[PDB]
Amino acid sequence: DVIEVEGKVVDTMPNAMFTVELENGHQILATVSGKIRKNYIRILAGDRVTVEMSPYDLTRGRITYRFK
Give the list of residues 6+ apart from residue 60 with CB closer than 8 angstroms, or none.
Answer: 28, 29, 30, 31, 53, 54
- HEC readout, 29-59: EEEECHHHHCCCCCCCCCCEEEEEECCCCCC
Question: If binding means CB under 5 A, how many residues of this protein chain bind Zn ion?
Answer: 4
Convert residues 6-45 into a mask of x (bound to Zn ion by CB under 5 A) and - (unbound). Answer: x------------------x-x------------------
Q: Which residues bind a second copy (CB under 8 A)?
A: 1-6, 21, 23-28, 50, 52-53, 55-56, 58-59, 64-65, 67
32 binds, among a second copy, Zn ion, none (CB under 5 to 8 A by kind): none
